[model samples]
Target chain A: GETTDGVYRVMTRRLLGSTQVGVGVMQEGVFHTMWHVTKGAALRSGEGRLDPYWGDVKQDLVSYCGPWKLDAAWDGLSEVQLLAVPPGERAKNIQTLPGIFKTKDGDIGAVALDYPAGTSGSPILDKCGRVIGLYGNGVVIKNGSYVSAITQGKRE
Target chain B: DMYIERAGDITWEKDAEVTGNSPRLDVALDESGDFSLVE
Candidate 1:
């Protein structure tokens, strides 16, 4: 079990160009993706720390997952490729669904991906589908996308 | 948001991961499959 503080890197890849996943530390509620870790000793010493509580963006993940449908839009980045990583497992043996976005309307911004396949992790289409978002590994979804009808089962 | 109490004596199992040397207090899932951390 990971306690205290944790870190993450929001990487983006598509074989086209590398787009930074906008690691903005949430300035006054608005996200700005301009950050540079101090050089040399500051990094090697490992004393450098970026405040997680200060940002609207999340780095360290916890429990709690979303139960999204196959026909929903997530954070403008449709589930072109979704890979679910089961809870409490260390290995990155994720369930990948490449080109899943080619299909119309996919689920997005649901924070119901916290727990494992069973438990309260309800049957989303099929329990075999990949897991999306979880509790600690939270997401800062688009603001306007949150609507009650959309979130009846789609959590934001 | 709700509270309940166990009617029997409590027990905890040990695990190597509990680095604090404190006995690992385990709460097997309840009848409804919910994990609890109640003391």
Candidate 2:
């Protein structure tokens, strides 16, 4: 089956009692997302691309996914409303979240949103639906989530 | 409100959308849940 769409579910321990859910996007034949989604996960038998890669943001913070070349391309605007999968959702749908581009002291820039539920690797998209960043862990105190800027990263 | 520094850097302007061609992936998860050097 050919996936002309960019976003896919990144899950771990799927054959277990409970599996974690995240978002994956394909670009340049490499699936991309936060490292938290791939670090301790196994490939879906008969479905996934076996190979994977990680990006350098002081460490292995982001992941470039498997052997599949599900090519997705777009330019972006960060301070706009974005779409992503809700937390713990395995459904075939996405929802919108409000965000503003932000910086927190020495941290990498992010797309800040007040969303209460979002997976670790959910794709943060622009108004026209361009995958801009992956939803990394965010500011807990402000009740805000910091989506990692996938733009300023270097694969190390 | 967080710092809005790199906000407009990447844009969905020009009426662009994410486009691609591949099937969905269904993979398993590792129990260790950590990443070593991809070495």
Candidate 3:
């Protein structure tokens, strides 16, 4: 299959923060990728806004972020994965996040990615109305930092 | 001249209770005969 650049675009979607999905950027036994965090939302609606918890904030790659695009991109990012369900939702929905999961260890995974704050499904709109920070830490760890961790995965 | 000498009563939301009197904007009247927050 041939992948095209700009073939796809990110969308604005809902981000429910405080969920704290199980994002382990730092590798454990089988996991190798280090310095990873769960996928985060890009933006959250502000006070006095209609949708206070809208999470449609955009990422660095795209123009806008919506529901459909977020669902798709969220499924793709390998390094940064979201917890199956919010820490609380876990009690009700069995024991997994309510979306897709990636099995592969390598690839970008969840790094080099931006997400919105959970709960707020709106994009963090800027003065020009362009998207900026999605929602959470909005930080990226360097690749070198994770090399040792990834190697450990192959070793085991 | 833009004085509403008989300004009526006003009501605010319950959550509008301010902790202090320092308002972001204030309106007043001076001898200049013109007093308004915006002005």
Candidate 4:
């Protein structure tokens, strides 16, 4: 039911038996994540919105999800943290990884993810230490420098 | 790049004969599992 114009955090925990699932809106017209899309977990429509068009792009939709959560008011200019169990690792040993996040304006609006390589479905925290967005896939490069990954999420 | 099917408490990773750094993860009843990041 969130039909605004901006990136919202999307998360799903214990999805497909895996914990710490993360997803974010990509620069392209797609939602990216590391979690393999599973039953019970889904990208509910009207939850995530992009400017210009927000129709059923299911044909471009791929696999990914977890226990979904969202941060309605997140500014992309803050210190963010990515929390998750190490890939191929156990839950008892969780890593609270740190990273950067930023939002775009004008014609291109998106969120960026800049965390460790094997960190997926990890929850992203803001500077005030609030859950902002879920860490999805794809990194962003600014002038040959590594910035963050582009992320997208859904609500509902 | 495969798919999962749930039959009872067990989950299967099917499809995708593709090769990667490793195979997909699977889960079973009374068993614990974790997610992996593809290198």
For model 3, residues A72-148, the per-residue Cα lDDT tens digits are 12233112212111222321101111111122322222122223322111122122222221222222233221110
Which portions of model 1 show Cα errors greater than 4 Å?
A1-45, A52-88, A91-108, A111-156, B1-39
lDDT of 1 by residue, B7-31 (tens): 1111112221211111122222233
Candidate 1 residue lDDT tens string, A1-156? 111111122223433453222111111221111122111111110232222212111112211111222232333332211122222232122221111111023322332222332111111111223223221221122332111101112223
By TM-score, the best candidate is: 2
The CA lDDT of each predicted structure is 0.20, 0.39, 0.19, 0.31
TM-score of 4: 0.33
Q: Please write out the lDDT profile of model 2 over residues A1-156, one tens digit for every residue.
A: 223345555544445544445555555545555554565333442343434454443433444444322223223323433344454543222333333233322223344334333255556555555564565544332223233333323432
Q: RMSD for each model, in Å, please?
A: 20.7, 12.7, 26.7, 16.3
TM-score of 3: 0.15
Candidate 4 DockQ vs. native:
0.02
Candidate 3 or 4, higher lDDT?
4
The DockQ of each candidate is 0.02, 0.04, 0.01, 0.02
Each prediction's TM-score versus the true structure: 0.20, 0.51, 0.15, 0.33
Better-scoring candidate (TM-score), 1 or 4: 4
Fnat of all models, as shown: 0.00, 0.03, 0.00, 0.00
**True lDDT of residue A36, candidate 2:** 49
Residue A57 Cα positional deviation in candidate 1, in Å, after optimal superposition: 10
TM-score of model number 2, chain B: 0.27
As a whole number from 0 to 100, the lDDT of residue A2 in candidate 3 is 11
How many pairs in model 1 have backbone atoms within 3 A of each other, for residues 3 or more apart or on separate chains, i.e. clashes?
Answer: 14
Q: B1-39 in candidate 4: lDDT tens per residue?
A: 122211111011123122211111121111111211222
